[PDB]
From a paper:
The S. cerevisiae respiratory SC is composed of complexes III2 (CIII, dimer of cytochrome bc1) and IV (CIV, Cyt c oxidase) with CIII flanked on each side by CIV in the core tetrameric SC (IV1III2IV1). CL is distinguished from other phospholipids by its unique dimeric structure containing two phosphates, four fatty acids and a free hydroxyl at the 2-position of the glycerol linking the two phosphatidyl groups. This unique dimeric structure makes CL ideal for supporting the organization of individual protein subunits into multi-subunit complexes, as well as individual complexes into supercomplex (SC) molecular machines, such as the mitochondrial respirasome. A presumed advantage in SC formation is bringing active sites of CIII and CIV in close proximity to each other to facilitate Cyt c shuttling of electrons. Here we show that anionic phospholipids interact with positive amino acids and appear to nucleate a phospholipid domain at the interface between the individual complexes, which dampen charge repulsion and further stabilize interaction, respectively, between individual complexes.
In total, four UQ6 ligands were placed into the map, two in each monomer of CIII, (UQ6 603 J, UQ6 603j at Qi sites and UQ6 606 J, UQ6 606j at Qo sites) with one UQ6 (606 J) having a large break in the tail density. All previously reported structures of the S. cerevisiae respiratory SC contained UQ6 bound in the Qi sites but empty Qo sites. In our structure, UQ6 interacts with His181 of the head domain of Rip1 (Rieske protein) in the Qo site of the opposite-side monomer of CIII, which interacts with the more poorly resolved CIV monomer. The Qo site on the reference-side of CIII, which interacts with the reference CIV, lacks a strong UQ6 tail density, which might be an indication of increased UQ6 flexibility at this site. Two CL molecules (CDL601K/k and CDL302C/c) at each CIII/CIV interface and one CL (CDL501J/j) within each of the monomers of CIII were fit into these densities allowing us to assign possible interactions of the CLs with the SC proteins and other phospholipids. One phosphate residue of CDL501J is in close proximity to Arg4 of Cob and His345 of Cor1 within CIII. Only CDL601K appears to interact with both CIII and CIV through phosphate moieties and Lys35 of Qcr8 in CIII and Lys487 of Cox1 in CIV, respectively. CDL302C is in close proximity to CDL601K, and its phosphates appear to interact with Lys44 and Lys51 of Rip1 on the surface of CIII at the interface with CIV.
Residue numbers in the entry:
A (entry chain Q): 45 to 146
B (entry chain S): 66 to 125
C (entry chain O): 1 to 269
D (entry chain U): 7 to 83
E (entry chain P): 16 to 251
F (entry chain N): 2 to 60
G (entry chain V): 22 to 66
H (entry chain W): 103 to 153
Write the structure that this text describes.
């Protein structure tokens, strides 16, 4: 309802900046997914950067699963494809190709 | 107000003193409000009522 | 020390009450009264003295609780502003329920204004139904009751202001006026207006007047209890939990009596 | 009734007719108990009490007139 | 008439008032049905869709559009379901020349109907009781627990008034088939003008407890033509 | 007065029930309820013992 | 870039099974009284 | 469900049935009288509901 | 009043004791519940 | 045993040891030392500037992070406090269960809390 | 046990007594209503050989026990005095003696009714006490007097409970809570207390008038003197209409609470919630004479009353839409309290809309005092009293006592009781819509099959209740063995689907009510420091 993405986006990155442990990472990510605002690739990249800061690969797996299934959004796929591949091959957190065939 | 209430009570509101003795032949033009069957009397002694005041009506 | 006890007894205005037998005994008294009355008015045994003693002991238990509710307010104390506000609000809601009772009594016959019905009445004023009307008969007492209430409300205001010899004079005047009122109530014991045989129009008025003759008794009982307490001088001009109750009662009873005198006396005549 | 007595009724616009019989009966009893020669003044509402009003009310009023304690408020005539 | 077994809808109509009541009933029930269908399907789809929802939309509080939509819709819905009730009350309560008037008093576990509008031989008032025939003393071919020794008669294609009252306890004049239902106050009378356009036998029992023996309250209404009504009156 | 403070001090010293005001009244009232109400409620069901059993069976 | 839906396809393929199931549930919930009516000797069968 | 129906069946068997009606002849007499009086024509004249 | 741990003290039952292994109490509760309808039916008529 | 002045709130031992002397006849006693019950503890305090049962909310604006978690004063073992965002009402009502040894966090608010009781023997 | 229980003065220690009396009374009343349905299965004296007075008396006992002695003592008092002081955070409610005298004044009503049924006199005039049928003219003996004292004592206990509720919630509410942040169940009980206070005295006065007429050889409503029972019916309905709201509103509160705590999302406009509740409470008084359209009032009066009814209906629809908004767009864990809440949202809504349909001024010509109205209120009572109480019990029992319940047993119990209630109450609308009367042990020979299906449903319902009491026993005897194994759910709110399970150890149960954040029930005078909200 006529709410700017930029303010809350910047809040998400700035909270990710001072992520001391995984608790604030978890709470901020849950709040971000709480809105209907589908996360941007930039905020997901910042979240993965915070997760790499806190060193818990399961957070990365969970957020990838959340991106794959968060909202129907008229069943858009290629957006999901790019938003996953850019952040997979930006630095490397190889996690999707193992839980699926198990 | 008190003194004029006392005056009006002693002027024409004292007529109820002789209402106890009244013939049953000049009753006011009343209606179905009375003269109907009443509760049967089982307990009590005084004129089929708790208070022995045979003054309200002359019909039993 | 001081801080810990202050926090542990500050928001706790409730005493660690002993195993008080008041609930079971009062419940037992009410149940005995109910069953005994049912057996006596229409049953197998028509004895009257035993049920009279049952009523007497129920009243003794009620008086015991009612004197405790004010003795523990001063002898035990342990009260704050919040509990005083709660007790006052409880007395206000009690008198509001009494006002609702009075309103129901009024509406029992006050809804027949323009005669909307057809038969069995529906005639205001009830022409033809002219027995000894209980209307305008006790107004000689209602006017003096209004005068007494007017002259004692401000006396009780000066009471709560000072609680001094002026308060004693006001209390004595109240005792005299309530004694006069109970005397003039009992003088019309049997033959007040009439009896109920036919034409129930003033009989409901007589019953409504009769059933309210206990609130003044309760007021007199509280006044006497406070009189005894201040003779014992336990209650100073401090936690006057009973003085406030009596002043609010006398400030609401005059209002309700005024509302009663507004209609039912000059309306329809 | 032969399916034709009044037709359209317009005496009282509102639906409820609780207070209707008294007014339609007072004039009838007054005209009947005054002259008894010609009923022309009250010849237009014959059915308002015979069939349009509860005849229990009519018989109760007749018995009350016999006993002298009328349900309504009229004079002694 | 007779309550049809295993029924799930209203009885057969007998009078225009009752069929108008039925029309108002079905008109109301249409919108009630659509409302209940809407709410039931909403419940069903919610529970069958969001039961698997992993993350809950927990920051939605305002919803102004739906707020105004379901704040303004019920008003017009209620107005459009209330207007037919008003017009039917206006039409039915119209006291359009009630041509017949009989007494109907609810006595202690029986009825004593008095017919004063008509006469029997010369000016006399016809009155008789209505006693329910006992179950043990039933005659073969009757209706159990309800059938009476003698019942009331009524002309067809006319207008009738049922003067209802009581003697000691309040009764009920419950005849759903004829579309009349007025309480029997102990002292207060009530006038209802029932006009019948259909012949037949209409049953009935008092819908008000009369103490203990209210399990057998015979109210049987039999509709006859004008010549048959004259023959019955002459016989009575 | 001259007895409020001493009474409160003694009651605080002796934290005991019965509130010290009416011990004789309590001892007088305690047996009365048991003597009276129990003996007046027992007939209520004792007398209809022979009355009870009205089967009123019909067939 | 409007990938896939076309709301109509997925919307129908999800609702139609759901609507059919809901209608069948209502049909059963109203046919059980009808089942009682049939099984009971309503017509001496 | 099977316990409920079984205990209902056994308690009804123990209680028994003592109605002098509900038999076929009563229903046929009723519908014959109804046809004589022509009541509920557009409905169900048959009221059997039991043996 | 502060001498209760708060485990089973909130119910007027007692696990300790061979007098009632939580069966006689429940049997008695069933009995008192079924008493009023059964006795009400029995006093004027058959069960 | 006898009248106690209790003019100061730091000289009263025993809540019932004070009754409050009054006057029989003359003028009304002043509402300072003539009240039965603990009511003097609040009335004299607010007469001299001491309140009872403060309703002041905690530091809502401060997030209470690791460096400076907020401090609550309660000598009891446990506590019932929480956060509603930096303003008065921001999110759904929520509160925590602080303990003497460990800490607790506010989940969605991220406001880390701490239990601070006064030293006890 | 006498030293602390029979002489109790603690709200927590007496709420459990409230519950015990509620469950015992319910089991007895369900047994007697089982009987009532059992003689209704087939025409004739299948089990009651004559004596329709016994049938009437059993009906009166059923109605009175469920109304005044079962659920009003349960959700008003038992839940109120266990949650409201607990949710506020105050150590103890003001004057627990009030609660004790309110509780202890119940049982003698039970014994006086049981002996009134025992005596040959009996009270067989319905749970409504309309004259003259309850006076010496028709019913002699002590049954009427015992019932009158029973209702008087129940009213007194209710008034005391309302007094305690009002004083606790308004005089010493905790500092953190204010007017604009007060939870929902307490608002419900507050409005309930207001309506109870404005409703009790008129009933007390009218019923005292009837008792005096029966005793003082007079008559104010009876025609014997010129009175008219229309006034008494006015007064009785003026009391009665608030009573259903009194018993139903705390159900609204608890249902809103459970759907809020289980949807993981906040309420939808709690200000709107309290607006709806307050509007309902204040508007309940506009229909004092809406229950007696059959009397013969004026057309304008009927129009005004039906307008008031249709106005009253709207806030309920607003509340239903609010619940739908709360459930929409949220994760749902399909636990048993959700099952009860959904059954409420369905069947209570359908019954209420049926009643709104009947609420037409001229529609009582078809349903009033028929089986349609019993199908009407059985629905809403069962949904908002039986199912509300079930939801509350299964929603608070694992913590208020520390004892869990078998989830499979709970599920099968819910399914059994739901199907039984549906199959019982549904046919009675078909019964009424034909026009069959009410309060008759024997009925004409038309709807035998519907009565039969009602009876088998009643047996299903009583089997469900027996399973429920067996569940109670198993919970009370096997709680520690059930907590350790996988027989029951030990965390009602599962973690959010982002959050790891190890971190979840310190996020056990966090919701919008303090009593869930407490440990195992501590000493009664807990809460040494009052809770404060920042
Ligand atoms: C709580 C309210 C309540 C409940 C539960 C019931 C339960 C039942 N009721 Fe009743 N009933 C009323 C409230 C209730 N009723 C009222 C107010 C009247 C008015 C009387 C009048 O109209 O004159 C009435 C009247 C009434 C009649 C009118 C009879 C006549 O016309 O004379 C009938 C007829 O069969 C009937 C049947 C039943 C049946 C078969 C059940 C069965 O469902 C019994 C099984 C019970 C339920 C399925 C609910 C579970 C109840 C419990 C107590 C479970 C216990 C556990 C907990 C409470 C924790 N009820
Ligand atoms: C739990 C108790 C309870 C509850 C909750 C209710 C709820 C309602 N009741 Fe009922 N009622 C009784 C108990 C109850 N009732 C009892 C005991 C009787 C007497 C039976 C006896 O005497 O034997 C009775 C009788 C009764 C009558 C007279 C019938 C009679 O003879 O019995 C009427 C009619 O005016 C009525 C109306 C309503 C209405 C309008 C509601 C509403 O509050 C329903 C609430 C639900 C909603 C209305 C849902 C919201 C609706 C919408 C979604 C909006 C849709 C419509 C619009 C556009 C506004 N009730
Ligand atoms: C172990 C002991 C088992 C004893 C078996 C006894 C069977 C029996 O009694 O007959 C079957 C019963 C009869 O039911 P009844 O009520 O006793 O007799 C009928 C009375 N009439 C119809 C005249 C009103 O009929 C029933 O009870 C039918 C039950 C309802 C059908 C259940 C269906 C379940 C799946 C759906
Ligand atoms: C158990 C599940 C919950 C209850 C559902 C059934 C209640 C309705 C009912 O029991 O209906 C009962 C009606 C009978 O009607 P009746 O008058 O002939 O009964 C009088 C004679 N008993 O049908 C039935 O017996 C259906 C029986 C099962 C038919 C399906 C299997 C056939 C093989
Ligand atoms: C369970 C539901 C049974 C329905 C039913 O048994 O229904 C009764 C009908 C016939 O009786 P009816 O309906 O024709 O009686 C109509 C007029 N009253 O079929 C049967 O007898 C089937 C019998 C099956 C027996 C199963 C075993 C029972 C235990 C017997 C031990 C001795
Ligand atoms: Cu009746
Ligand atoms: Cu009747
Ligand atoms: Cu209502």
């Amino acid at each position: 309802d006529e709410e700017t993405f930029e303010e809350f986006t910047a809040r998400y990155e700035k909270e990710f900046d001072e992520a001391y442990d995984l608790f604030e990472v978890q709470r901020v990510l849950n709040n971000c997914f709480s809105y209907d605002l589908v996360p941007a690739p930039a905020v997901i990249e910042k979240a993965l950067r915070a997760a790499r800061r806190v060193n818990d690969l399961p957070t990365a797996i969970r957020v990838f699963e959340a991106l794959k299934y968060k909202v129907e959004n008229e069943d858009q796929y290629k957006a999901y494809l790019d938003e996953l591949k850019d952040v997979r091959q930006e630095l490397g957190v190889p996690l999707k190709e193992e839980l699926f065939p198990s | 107000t008190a003194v004029n209430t006392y005056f009006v009570e002693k002027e024409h509101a004292e007529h109820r003193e002789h209402l106890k003795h009244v013939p049953d032949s000049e009753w006011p033009r009343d209606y179905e409000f009375m003269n109907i069957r009443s509760k049967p009397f089982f307990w009590g002694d005084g004129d089929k009522t708790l208070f022995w005041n045979p003054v309200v009506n002359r019909h039993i | 020390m001081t801080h810990l006890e202050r926090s542990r007894h500050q928001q706790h205005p409730f005493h660690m009450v002993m195993p008080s037998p008041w609930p079971i005994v009062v419940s037992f008294a009410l149940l005995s009264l109910a069953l005994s009355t049912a057996l006596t008015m229409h049953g197998y045994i028509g004895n009257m003295n035993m049920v009279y003693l049952a009523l007497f002991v129920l009243l003794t238990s009620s008086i015991l609780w009612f004197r405790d509710i004010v003795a523990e307010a001063t002898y035990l104390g342990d009260h704050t502003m919040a509990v005083r506000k709660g007790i006052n609000l409880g007395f206000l809601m009690f008198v509001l329920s009494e006002v609702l009772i009075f309103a129901g009594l009024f509406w029992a016959y006050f809804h027949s204004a323009m005669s909307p019905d057809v038969t069995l009445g529906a005639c205001w004023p009830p022409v033809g139904i002219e027995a000894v009307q209980p209307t305008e008969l006790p107004l000689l007492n209602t006017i003096i009751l209004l005068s007494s209430g007017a002259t004692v409300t401000y006396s009780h205001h000066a009471l709560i202001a000072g609680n001094r010899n002026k308060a004693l004079s006001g209390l004595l005047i109240t005792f005299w006026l309530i004694v006069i009122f109970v005397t003039c109530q009992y003088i019309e014991y049997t033959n007040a207006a009439f009896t109920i045989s036919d034409g129930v129009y003033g009989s409901v008025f007589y019953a409504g007047t009769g059933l309210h003759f206990l609130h003044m008794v309760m007021l007199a009982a509280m006044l006497g209890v406070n009189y005894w307490r201040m003779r014992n001088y336990h209650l100073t001009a401090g936690h006057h939990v009973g003085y406030e109750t009596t002043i609010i009662y006398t400030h609401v009873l005059d209002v309700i009596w005024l509302f009663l005198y507004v209609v039912f006396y000059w309306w329809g005549v | 009734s032969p399916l034709h007595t009044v037709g359209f009724d317009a005496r009282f616009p509102q639906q409820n007719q609780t207070k209707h019989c008294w007014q339609s009966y007072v004039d009838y009893h007054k005209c009947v108990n005054m002259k008894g020669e010609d009923f022309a003044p009250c010849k237009v509402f014959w059915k308002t009490y015979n069939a349009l009003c509860p005849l229990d009310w009519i018989e109760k009023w007749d018995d009350q007139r016999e006993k002298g304690i009328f349900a309504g408020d009229i004079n002694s005539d | 008439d007779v309550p049809t077994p295993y029924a799930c809808y209203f009885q057969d109509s007998a009078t225009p008032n009752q069929e108008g009541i039925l029309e108002l009933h079905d008109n109301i029930m249409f919108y009630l049905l659509v409302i209940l269908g809407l709410v039931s399907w909403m419940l069903y789809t919610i529970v069958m869709t969001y039961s698997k929802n992993p993350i809950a939309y927990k920051y939605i509080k305002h919803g102004q559009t739906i707020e105004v939509i379901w704040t303004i819709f019920p008003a017009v819905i209620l107005l459009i379901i209330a207007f037919p009730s008003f017009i039917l009350l206006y039409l039915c309560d119209e006291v359009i020349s009630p041509a017949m008037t009989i007494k109907a008093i609810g006595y202690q576990w029986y009825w004593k109907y008095e017919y004063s509008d008509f006469i029997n031989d010369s000016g006399e008032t016809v009155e008789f009781e209505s006693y329910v025939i006992p179950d043990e003393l039933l005659e073969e071919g009757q209706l159990r627990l309800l059938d009476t020794d003698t019942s009331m008669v009524v002309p067809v294609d006319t207008h009738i008034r049922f003067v209802v009252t009581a003697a000691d306890v309040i009764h009920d004049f419950a005849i759903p088939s004829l579309g009349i239902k007025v309480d029997a106050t102990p002292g207060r009378l009530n006038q209802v003008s029932a006009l019948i356009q259909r012949e037949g036998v209409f049953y009935g029992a008092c819908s008000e407890l009369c103490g203990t023996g209210h399990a057998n309250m015979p109210i049987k209404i039999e509709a006859v033509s004008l010549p048959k009504f004259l023959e019955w009156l002459n016989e009575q | 007065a001259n007895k409020v403070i001493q009474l409160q001090k003694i009651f605080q010293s002796s934290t005991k029930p019965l509130w010290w005001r009416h011990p004789r009244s309590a001892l007088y009232l305690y047996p009365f309820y048991a003597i009276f109400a129990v003996a007046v409620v027992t007939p209520l069901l004792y007398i209809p013992n022979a009355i009870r059993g009205i089967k009123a069976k019909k067939a | 870039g409007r990938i896939g839906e076309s709301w109509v396809i997925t919307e129908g393929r999800r609702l139609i099974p759901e609507i059919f199931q809901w209608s069948a549930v209502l049909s059963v919930c109203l046919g059980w009284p009808g089942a009682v009516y049939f099984f009971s000797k309503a017509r001496k069968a | 469900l099977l316990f409920s129906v079984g205990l209902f069946a056994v308690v009804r068997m123990a209680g028994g049935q003592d109605a002098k009606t509900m038999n076929k002849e009563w229903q046929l007499k009723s519908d014959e009288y109804l046809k004589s009086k022509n009541a509920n024509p557009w409905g169900g004249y048959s009221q059997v509901q039991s043996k | 009043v502060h001498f209760k741990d708060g485990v089973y003290e909130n119910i007027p039952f007692k696990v300790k004791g061979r007098k009632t292994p939580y069966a006689l109490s429940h049997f008695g509760f069933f009995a008192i519940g079924f008493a009023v309808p059964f006795v009400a039916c029995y006093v004027q008529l058959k069960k | 045993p006898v009248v106690k002045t209790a003019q100061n709130l730091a000289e009263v031992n025993g809540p019932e040891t004070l009754i409050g002397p009054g006057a029989k006849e003359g003028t009304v006693p002043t509402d300072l030392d003539q009240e039965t019950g603990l009511a003097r503890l609040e009335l004299l305090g607010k007469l001299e500037g001491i309140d009872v049962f403060d309703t002041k909310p905690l530091d809502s604006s401060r997030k209470g992070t690791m460096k400076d978690p907020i401090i609550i004063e309660s000598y009891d073992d446990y506590r019932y406090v929480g956060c509603t965002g930096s303003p008065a009402g921001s999110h759904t009502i929520m509160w925590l269960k602080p303990t003497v040894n460990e800490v607790a966090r506010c989940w969605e608010c991220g406001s880390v809390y701490k239990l601070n009781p006064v030293g006890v023997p | 046990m006498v030293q602390r229980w029979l002489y109790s003065t603690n709200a927590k220690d007496i709420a459990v007594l409230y519950f015990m009396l509620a469950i015992f009374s319910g089991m007895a009343g369900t047994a007697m209503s089982l009987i009532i349905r059992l003689e209704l299965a087939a025409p004739g004296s299948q089990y009651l050989h004559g004596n329709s007075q016994l049938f009437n008396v059993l009906v009166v006992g059923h109605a009175v026990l469920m109304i005044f002695f079962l659920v009003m003592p349960a959700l008003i008092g038992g839940f109120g005095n266990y949650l409201l002081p607990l949710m506020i955070g105050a150590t103890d409610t003001a004057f627990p003696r009030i609660n004790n005298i309110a509780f202890w004044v119940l049982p003698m009503g039970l014994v006086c009714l049981v002996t009134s049924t025992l005596v040959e006199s009996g009270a067989g005039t319905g749970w409504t006490v309309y004259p003259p049928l309850s006076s010496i003219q028709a019913h002699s003996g002590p049954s009427v007097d015992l019932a009158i004292f029973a209702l008087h004592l129940t009213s007194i206990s209710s008034l005391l409970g309302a007094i305690n509720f009002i004083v606790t919630t308004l005089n010493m509410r905790t500092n953190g809570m204010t007017m604009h942040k007060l939870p929902l169940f307490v608002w419900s009980i507050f409005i309930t207390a207001f309506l109870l206070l404005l409703s009790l005295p008129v009933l007390s006065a009218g019923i005292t008038m009837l008792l005096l007429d029966r005793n003082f050889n007079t008559s104010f409503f009876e025609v014997s003197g010129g009175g008219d029972p229309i006034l008494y019916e006015h007064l009785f309905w003026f009391f009665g209409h608030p009573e259903v709201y009194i018993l139903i509103i705390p159900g609204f509160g608890i249902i809103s609470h459970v759907v809020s705590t289980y949807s993981k999302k906040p309420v939808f406009g709690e200000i709107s919630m309290v607006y709806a509740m307050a509007s309902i409470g204040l508007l309940g008084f506009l229909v004092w004479s809406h229950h007696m359209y059959i009397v013969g009032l004026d057309a304008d009066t009927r129009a005004y009353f039906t307008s008031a009814t249709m106005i009253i209906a709207i806030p309920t629809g607003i509340k239903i839409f609010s619940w739908l908004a709360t459930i929409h767009g949220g994760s749902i864990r399909l636990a048993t309290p959700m099952l009860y809440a959904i059954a409420f949202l369905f069947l209570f809504t359908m019954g209420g809309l049926t009643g709104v349909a009947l609420a037409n001024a001229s529609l009582d010509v078809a349903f009033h005092d028929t089986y349609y109205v019993v199908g009407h209120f059985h629905y809403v009572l069962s949904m908002g009293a039986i199912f509300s109480l079930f939801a509350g019990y299964y929603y608070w029992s694992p913590q208020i006592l520390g004892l869990n319940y078998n989830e499979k047993l709970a599920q099968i119990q819910f399914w059994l009781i739901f199907i039984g209630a549906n199959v019982i109450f549904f046919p009675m609308h078909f019964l009424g819509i034909n026009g069959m009367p009410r309060r008759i042990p024997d009925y004409p020979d038309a709807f035998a099959g519907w009565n039969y299906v009602a009876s088998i449903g009643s047996f299903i319902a009583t089997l469900s209740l027996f399973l429920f009491i067996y569940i109670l026993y198993d919970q009370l005897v096997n709680g520690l063995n059930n907590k350790v194994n996988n027989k029951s759910v030990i965390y009602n709110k599962a973690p959010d689907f982002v959050e790891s399970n190890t971190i979840f150890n310190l996020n056990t149960v966090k919701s919008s009510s303090i009593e869930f954040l407490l440990t195992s029930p501590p000493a009664v005078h807990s809460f040494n420091t009052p809770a404060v909200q920042s």
